[model samples]
Target: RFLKVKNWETDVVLTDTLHLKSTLETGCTEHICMGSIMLPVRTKDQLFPLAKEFLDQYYSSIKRFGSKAHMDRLEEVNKEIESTSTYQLKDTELIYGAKHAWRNASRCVGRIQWSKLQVFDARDCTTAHGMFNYICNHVKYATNKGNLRSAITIFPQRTDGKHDFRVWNSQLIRYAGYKQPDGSTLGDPANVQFTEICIQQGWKAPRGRFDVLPLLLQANGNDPELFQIPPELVLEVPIRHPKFDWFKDLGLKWYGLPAVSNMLLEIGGLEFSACPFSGWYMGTEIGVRDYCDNSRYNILEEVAKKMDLDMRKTSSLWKDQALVEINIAVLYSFQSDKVTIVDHHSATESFIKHMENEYRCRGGCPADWVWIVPPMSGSITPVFHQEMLNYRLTPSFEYQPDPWNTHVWKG
Candidate 1:
């Protein structure tokens, strides 16, 4: 049987040969693309099997598969799970597992640096206050005064699936979005709902566009409590174009650390619901999507007006010019401030190398092409031409339900 797919707009063709190598059960089918959905949670019955698989992988990674240490560890895991329905991971195992999770993150285009991640094991934390302290420490350590080390602080694992620790914020550092009386958002439009939640938790809103949101941390299925991240720990870069001095008038700034706090870290069958991971920003993430998106800051029109470009016509390419300058400004601003950031071109090139390395070692690297490609320039990036098969893998960073939405904690 032969199957061929064609895109007339780009004259792109796909044959069965590629699909033959792919496991089609990866949440994608003929009628629907389920690439964006979260991976299903493992059931109690499925836990030991998954845990066994992970242990097998972990042993193999250390070149000790089926060794006495490996077999003994596997038996120990089985006994622990049989007695308590869950088990603990060794400190070394946790470290390796976290790195593997990042490496297996299908949506990430920077897996080339996966091995460099620094993990902070905060599994001993038991209270919301302790979570706040751990998070603050993580932010400070990862920020590293703008040097921006890639790191994750992992809280206790989910035991009963009901009593889970979770970081309510989508990111460790994100701007507040105040809903104005004029039916418009004053700050980051993306965070309006989260801002409201913070207020409901008794936080006094500053109502500023760039006011950083506080952390809403839930520990042991307890109600989330708000904790403000120290301003000194958050290193922000003021955006300014290298050649255009007037660009500073926009009053744009972004935090140096891009710490994703909402995603679950799955290692074996254990789920870390409150693992906050951070890495340096990619310039286009701020410049292209954040600045230009209509739902976001929507600054392209303003930048175009400042440049005296013809906005009346799409053919004039004002949007394109503004995008490049904004991206250039972001790159220049971060570089001048000595903050860690990667330009889209360089980031994509590294992804290509990562892909090649993965293919050589693992036969396949699961990737989401739509997300792997940078938002501003698709065709220009090497990843745009690359065919990717998306699939869930063990020890992955996974999206989880919002802590506020799932739990009835508001009193």
Candidate 2:
């Protein structure tokens, strides 16, 4: 009846019922960690219920001959494990949990094929270098030598119920942004703060825009460690307009794949705070959100100029025109290189079909209409016109704390 509690701390016991006993030194659940969350700002009350949800989900479906025994399992855990008790998930269970979580991830439009997602189980990696090794493997496997595949490699979960291993880079590939005297940024503006974190952490600050951001990872909340992704291991596509040779002069490009890090991967209520996953691109995600968004690269004006569009007239639709061209170029570049990428129109259509499938399977599908709508052409897709419902599904990927501001015990 003894558990070797490690890397865990306790916080305000929600109820007078103290079932889990602490063997090691403990602290507040918040001290256990905020776990890199962004939305629904986390508190201990929310977390306790979440853990209960996870217990139910895990126990209910964790077997070949299951009786939907989650309720019974919850009762058992309620009587047994206390607030500070450590829990470990079997690797097979974790893999299944991750896959199911992706299927339940309403925000990701690519969830239609969640069953095809490749889950990499690396829950045993406990050190910074170990995370880098697994990350390299994740990148290589997902890249598939330019023939990309949808995948995620899970690092260790917070068994002690604290924030643990995680990658700070939102994506494995990001461009460095340099703030200039002109009050404009030269690289990916979204990553400016993170890029500075990398430079301060000792990686060479890039000399130009479009430089690949090195992987910044924190293990066990240790000092962030940085690693340069070997160029040979990356696949980048140059952006050029089909109609404008001048566009090629802009020197625009982006990586062929998009793998998101910094998401909290929750399975059965346990947070594996550092699992990174990827879905093949939907062109607008790159061309519009990354390139044209005002807070990001903001290429609309420059692109309008190149196209000879009249920016002086607000009625000219110059921004719209430029966005279309940028999106088209992205589709063209990816198709030309035989890399897998989807256009907004096609992707939304497929998403509708996915919704239909999910409805048939789960009686309903939870979708965020705003997210389902493509960035550039919202009114065009069938999904844009349809009513969508959003709700919390357990065993889902949720936002977490930014690792840079969290437990980074570095040299």
Candidate 3:
């Protein structure tokens, strides 16, 4: 199904201000007396033209399910964005500054808001994994900390699905416990005694999308003192319905009744599922390209071509060109720990050589260099690859430094 394309430029209000009164008395302190105003300005004006261009190009090129569906989805997302409490900068800077609000707001709302996948369903697990992986990769690259790892656990028990929610929750809890930071208990024994569980879900109704809630745990298994749930904690399930509208109304009022006793846990039923092979192929291609030489670039390119074909046949979500660029960056990053421009050049050369060696080692000269070239593949393409490389190569440098850094980093 092709998605419906909308010209938001024609429909959206570019400049709308929502005046709000100051809470403090008029004659009070300067800071307290300062009033705040909320504005719902077009995000397109706040962000770079490049970002807007990127979205326009991406949306136009990709096949949408249908016009009405796409329009409805976009509407829903905009509504959700509008209904949410405006951040301090929302009026002044627009939601542009809110990009770092939290995972639910930044990554989920900003980047993956357009995704047409269910967060809780196991069938959509790959999409979830991809989203999580993408976020982690960005974070790691941005921080220049290879050890930074993100763990996401979906609590299906809080959803409407009639599956074995307890087992899933138990498994996730167990896994989370094992991965807890060093010097933590295996599992907080007191967590079992908690009277309530809370889940917060965010939605972009215009996009027909919702995000997984951020879950916070109090303690590990063994520490009873740390295991007690705080009074502010309340257990509630968050579910997104197709009919929900975020702009006109708030969705928090729809929380489910809290379960009192032991929640009825459902038993497992097996469903035949397979991890997408594209990830493995892409990863291996990257590994091989990184260790090899420039002669192998052609071979790698060929493999990429075939990979693109496979992706198209299997209905993969990512752009083939984007995937190729990603592989190139990954291969280059793997070649040298301390990256220099020269190192990047060497890495590219090594990638091609590695492909050549693989072909030679197999005793089969398959195709010529650049043999399986895709029409869209290019070496000089500037598509966020440099940003990714810069992120991995530099530690102290930031794409967008925190605004508060000026006060904190005064030298």
The best candidate by lDDT is 1
Q: Alpha-carbon error at 1 in model 1, in Å?
A: 16
Ranking by TM-score: 1, 2, 3
lDDT of 2 at 220: 73
For candidate 1, the TM-score is: 0.92
Clashes of each: 0, 14, 37
Name the runs in model 2 displaced over 4 angstroms: 1-84, 160-163, 408-411
True-structure lDDT of candidate 2: 0.73
Error of 1 at 2 (Å): 16
Summarize candidate 1's per-residue lDDT along 106-214 as a digit string, tens digits: 7899899999999999999999999999888988888888888899999999877778899999999999998888898898999999999999889998888899999
* Model 2: per-residue Cα lDDT over 1-411, one tens digit each: 311211112221111111131121212264453222224224444455655666655554545234545565555544444554534565666777888788766677777777788888887788888888888888888888668889989888774434477788988888898777888888888878888888888888756888999998778766678889888888889888777778888888889879889888776556778889987899989998988878998888988887888898889888888888888898998888888888877777788778766655555566556566787778767666666555556567777778656563546
| TM-score of each model, paired residue for residue | 0.92, 0.82, 0.19
Question: Tell me, what's the RMSD of every candidate?
Answer: 3.5, 10.9, 25.0
Name the top TM-score candidate: 1
Candidates arranged by lDDT, highest first: 1, 2, 3
For each candidate, the alpha-carbon lDDT, in order, equals 0.86, 0.73, 0.23
What's the C-alpha lDDT at position 1 in model 3? Answer: 18
